[PDB]
Design a binder for these strands. Structure first.
Lengths: 92, 124, 74, 90
RNA sequence: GAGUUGAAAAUAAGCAGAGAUCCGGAGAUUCCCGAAUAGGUCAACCUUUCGAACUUCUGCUGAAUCCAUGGGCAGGCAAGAGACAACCUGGCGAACUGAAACAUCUUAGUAGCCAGAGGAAAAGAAAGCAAAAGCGAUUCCCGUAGUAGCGGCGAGCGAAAUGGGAGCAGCCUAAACCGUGAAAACGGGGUUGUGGGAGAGCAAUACAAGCGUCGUGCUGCUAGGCGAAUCAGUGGAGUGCGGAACCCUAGAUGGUGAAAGUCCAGUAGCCGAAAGCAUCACUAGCUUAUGCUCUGACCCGAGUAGCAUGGGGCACGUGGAAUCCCGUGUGAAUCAGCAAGGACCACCUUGCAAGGCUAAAUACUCCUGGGUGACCGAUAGCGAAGUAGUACCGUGAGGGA
RNA sequence: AGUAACGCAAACAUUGGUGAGAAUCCAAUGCCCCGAAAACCUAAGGGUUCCUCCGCAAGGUUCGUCCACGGAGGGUGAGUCAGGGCCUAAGAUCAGGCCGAAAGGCGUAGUCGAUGGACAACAGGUGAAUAUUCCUGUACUACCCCUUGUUGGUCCCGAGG
RNA sequence: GUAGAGAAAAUGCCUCGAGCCAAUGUUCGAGUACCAGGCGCUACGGCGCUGAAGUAACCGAUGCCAUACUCCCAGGAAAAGCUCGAACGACCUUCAACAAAAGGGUACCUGUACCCGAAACCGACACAGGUAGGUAGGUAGAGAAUACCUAGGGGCGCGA
């Protein structure tokens, strides 16, 4: 059997995007975009929940904790997909 | 103002049982604005107070805008207590108490205890 | 513990008295000594920690009824 | 507004509808973050309806007759394999 | 039965006279830590073969060792762990103090510490008190009584019996004997005291009472419902005052601009439960079971009682020191007996230890639901009427507004 | 009592700017100080003090337009760096085992336990707050797939290191 | 290579190998980078285009070789990773397992700000005190003392 490290309610593993101006800097400059996830999350569970719900090959998943408690995730997509054409569809 | 906040048994506020519904014609019994009829507008169950139309006059001053313009003076009603009002039928002009008649159907309706008509309004 | 499993003999809280009636505590306890007694239902020695009164039972009454009186044999 | 249809639907379409309403709830989180015009009441009855769905599913766990910890092992034995899928509203 | 999405306003959208919000009964979820329990852990995390780990129970396989034991594997809604203010029981157990010092003694078997357990616990059904008269398990209260005593006869400690009340309830088991098995057990019998039981024989049948998933019964509780009777004048406001009326099976209370029988919520009274719990009363049913005569043989709880010692505790400090329980060592008798009646002996009286279980009266408050208060009113009353065991201090125990 | 003091005797001065208000905030020019630091980075600790804007009620031993202060928002990106997914020392906990009024004491296997042993990334740029972490270049680890052979392989055990 | 119960190892015997070891070094990485300068506007805070030489020698490290040698007694951790290997023991077996050769794919949690010879840590203070470790420029000097300075950072939060 292929167990994950922790079973963590995968339709709630992502919470909200970040709409700061530096996030748009990461879109136009990095082909990346910014999500807010819960602390109980992975570079294997978030990375699977982007290539399925969105339909995009994700390059890397750079995560960090934020001292108010919640977790911040810079997800960088592949070169084949612009983050600007996939972020205006959501509302960025 | 902690001396006047709502009491909360099991996180929900204790709501009072009263005798005035919306759309009723109340009379002010004693306090202040004595002896004038009126509809009620908005209801406040925790204070047991009721705001009624076009009688209680509280001329309040409001800073209107954020640009500092026109600063309007708005004349707004306040809360008179629910024990200071009675109900009124427009056929017999007399302020009367309440009563709960159980009619032929299952429903139980209000009743002016001195006259013979029903306070209770249908679905419209 | 300083108890015998067969007969429930424990220590005795019993003061000692000098000539001028001074009393210390002197916890007084039984001679429950190490032995290794033969067992007829297995024809073999068991290693036990027996008080001497319990020794007089297992030689007088036999080890079977004494060990079933305590409840334990293995 | 009575939800009479939930005790009519079988367990597979029940569970698929749970996953669809959770996905629509995540779309309501994206539309709430996007500041597009949204209904917060739908954000209420979405999760509030998934509560109805899991009460009916858990009653169906009850009338077979199994333990609470067997429902823990069965439920967590199911939650480990949920491939994410977007809702059919496109 | 009419508005709601807590405090807590505002804003955006809802939910609702095919009955929302809310209340009550029974259920569901309950991330992570914490008995914490898959393993580790620096609690609320990490690693995961996603696991009730360990002990106990059941089942299989069954080491040194033949039977065993240990181990391993498995099952299991799976019994225990952990928490609990005070009371209760069991064990360790002081010292300051009092004696005008202090060691015997007291404080004190109190505090404290550990363990356990219930709404009560312990004890409890006479090997008992008593005195020639009598009582009939245990517990608690008043009393005897500050008496008899005990005590460097100092300081102090201090019963018990007779009497009066609360509450009452008594039952299972071993042995002698029959039957099955190598014992060990099992099934019948018997469990009592101015003695029974076993063995042998004769009679004789049903009155009364005890226990109880199960469901109809009753009241009570956890939501509630109806519920009597007035206006007007007065300096902000009237419930107060003055004038006119009424209710009362309701004049308890709280509020309402201001103090209320007639304004509201209510109250007196009458009602009301789908669901759960509790109270006693039914029920298929299990049970208790009887009387006489002969028979001193057989039995009536053994390393036990007693004794020599070392003690402890009974108010009794080793004293004439009995009763009760233990440490070492010795070590009985079965009813024609044994133990107690304050060393001990003789007679009489009383009871039958060395096997267990029991409700009530009883002690207390972390509390809960009612009713009160010659109790407080922000230096008071709980430490705490707001963030209260909070800010703050300490490494921590802890202190603390 | 409006008294001592205002926390080294490195030392500031002027011109402009901002404002209602400037010895103190900013900018420039000189002057002066540390320079095995009074420089830069990381271990511990602290916990948001870091950055933009706003404010000057309290704090700053003066003032203040400034602030490690108050309010709102943001910021900490790792296969390679440091720990864990590896290992053990001191030490701790110790299954069974011995002991002990209780609690627990001793002690073996085992398991934790870095201050050590093992293991793979450097240079330039970006940037109000991040850089061996983000971008670009060249690399290196640990597994899978793609081609040749092998029927045995993994772990425990024996040894070198 | 053998020999003994002897797979590896260890010990004993025999044989082949004159070289070996490691900092440093040349090239690629690596220049259509960086860089002095000039060229055009200032929100005058900087951006924009172009770009020369980029070598040699003397000193010389407390850094490497280097757990390299010499000397001494006071005699200098453990286990895993790694490498080699028979029997015994548990499991899986053929397109399964093992060992490589190029080429692609994949990349586990926590810490990452800021102060850290301190105004933010510890001394109740924005306290003349304390705090492990790393980098060690020039001149005069034996020197990490000292005196003055580059980089970088300040003028010590009352003044007259």
């Amino acid at each position: 059997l292929k167990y994950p490290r922790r079973i963590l309610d995968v339709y709630q593993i992502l919470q909200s995007p970040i709409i700061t101006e530096a996030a748009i800097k990461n879109i136009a400059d990095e082909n990346s975009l910014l999500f807010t996830v819960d602390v109980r999350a992975d570079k294997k569970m978030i990375r699977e929940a982007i290539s399925n719900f969105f339909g995009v090959k994700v390059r890397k998943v750079n995560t960090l904790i934020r001292p108010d408690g919640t977790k911040k995730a810079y997800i960088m997509l592949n070169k084949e997909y612009n983050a600007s054409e996939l972020a205006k569809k959501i509302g960025i | 103002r902690w001396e006047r906040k709502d009491c909360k048994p099991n996180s929900l506020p204790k709501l009072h049982k009263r005798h005035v519904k919306v759309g009723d014609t109340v009379k002010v019994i004693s306090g202040g604005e004595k002896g004038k009829i009126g509809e009620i507008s908005k209801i406040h169950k925790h204070n047991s107070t009721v705001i009624i139309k076009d009688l209680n006059f509280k001329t309040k001053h409001v800073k209107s805008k954020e640009e500092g313009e026109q600063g309007q003076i708005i004349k707004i009603e306040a809360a008179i207590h629910s024990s200071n009002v009675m109900l009124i039928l427009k056929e017999q002009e007399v302020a009367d108490r309440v009563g709960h008649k159980i009619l032929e159907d299952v429903r139980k309706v209000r009743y002016l205890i001195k006259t013979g008509e029903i306070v209770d309004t249908p679905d419209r | 513990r300083r108890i015998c499993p067969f007969t429930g003999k424990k220590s005795n809280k019993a003061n000692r008295v000098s000539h001028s009636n001074h009393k210390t505590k002197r916890l007084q306890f039984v001679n429950l000594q190490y032995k290794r007694v033969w067992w007829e239902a297995g024809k073999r020695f068991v290693k036990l920690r027996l008080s001497t009164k319990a020794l007089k039972t297992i030689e007088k009454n036999g080890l079977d009824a004494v060990a079933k009186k305590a409840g334990i044999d293995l | 507004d009575e939800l009479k249809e939930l005790r009519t639907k079988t367990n597979e379409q029940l569970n698929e509808e749970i996953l669809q309403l959770k996905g629509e709830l995540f779309m309501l989180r994206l539309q709430r973050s996007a500041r597009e015009n949204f209904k917060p009441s739908d954000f209420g009855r979405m999760r509030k309806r998934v509560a109805r769905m899991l009460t009916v599913k858990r009653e169906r766990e009850i009338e077979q007759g199994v333990g609470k910890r067997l429902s823990r092992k069965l439920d967590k034995a199911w939650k480990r394999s949920i491939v994410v899928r977007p809702p059919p509203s496109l």
